[PDB]
Amino acid sequence: GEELFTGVVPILVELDGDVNGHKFSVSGEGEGDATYGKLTLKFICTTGKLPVPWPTLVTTLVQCFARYPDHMKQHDFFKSAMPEGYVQERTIFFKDDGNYKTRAEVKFEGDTLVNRIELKGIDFKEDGNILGHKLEYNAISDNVYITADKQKNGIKANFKIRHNIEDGSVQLADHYQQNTPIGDGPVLLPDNHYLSTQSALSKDPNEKRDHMVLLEFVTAAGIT
């Protein structure tokens, strides 16, 4: 499982979304290098204009690429589930606004690590920060707090993302996450720890489609 990540691995992401009945699709390509916790990705809205802010999709759009320090390798659930993969589900509660519910399957297709996602968003405000596009195209950085879930043979996680709003304020997105293996083989059930994650968002100056370029670092921590 871990051996599948010792080099650079191609990534494919495919997302189908429906937020308040606004339907859209995103496709992504890039590479991950778990040795350095490093991800480089480019996403394109294939249906036209994205109806929500790109920053709100970052966490949805492959924590198997986390750098787990040598001394914490027995706590890496994500790679232990490979190549068969895992289901990753979230509910993301946007404070004073709607929620996303996401279901994804993360697995290998040949040599390529694939993340296939369905996203459903409901109860958003038409002129809120999300459907009104009031969030700054700004990096996000925070800690993903992971705990074991023995009853599902997987993990749970929780974290908060504070998205900057255009007026200087913050739009909180409270994340609740569950991962469960797809295969029936043994997986690593971790002690409590976190992934320290930083995502830098940018634009391809030659790209005319609605898109997002990401450079992301992911590092496991919190166990000495």
Author numbering: 4 to 64, 68 to 230
Paper text:
Indeed, two types of radiation damage could be defined: (i) global damage, which is mainly observed in reciprocal space and corresponds to a degradation of the diffraction properties of a crystal, and (ii) specific damage, which is mainly observed in real space and corresponds to the photoreduction of metal centres, the photoreduction of photoactive protein chromophores, the breakage of covalent bonds (for example disulfide bridges) and/or the loss of electron density for the side chains of some amino acids. Here, a series of MX experiments are described which suggest that specific and global radiation damage are much less decoupled at room temperature than they are at cryogenic temperatures. In addition to Cerulean, two other systems were studied: lysozyme, in order to examine the photoreduction of disulfide bonds at RT, and the photoadduct of the LOV2 domain of phototropin 2 from Arabidopsis thaliana, which upon light activation forms a covalent bond between the protein and its cofactor that is particularly sensitive to specific radiation damage at cryogenic temperatures. In other words, and in contrast to the situation at cryogenic temperature, specific and global radiation damage evolve on similar dose scales at room temperature for these three systems, all of which involve covalent-bond breakage.
Fluorescent proteins of the green fluorescent protein family are β-barrel-shaped proteins that contain a fluorescent chromophore formed by the autocatalytic cyclization of three consecutive amino-acid residues and, as such, they provide convenient genetically encoded fluorescent reporters of localization or interaction in cellulo. The sensitivity of fluorescent proteins to specific X-ray-induced radiation damage at cryogenic temperature has been well documented, showing that the conserved glutamate residue close to the chromophore (Glu222 according to the GFP sequence) appears to be specifically affected at relatively low absorbed doses [i.e. ∼0.1, 0.8 and 0.1 MGy for IrisFP, EGFP and mNeonGreen, respectively]. Given the sensitivity of this residue in fluorescent proteins to specific radiation damage, the cyan fluorescent protein Cerulean, which produces well diffracting crystals, was chosen as the first target in the work described here. Cerulean possesses a radiosensitive glutamate residue next to the chromophore, the side chain of which is severely affected by specific radiation damage (decarboxylation) during cryo-MX experiments. To evaluate the characteristic dose at which specific radiation damage occurs at 100 K in crystals of Cerulean, we analysed the evolution of the atomic B factors of the progressively radiolysed carboxylate group of Glu222.
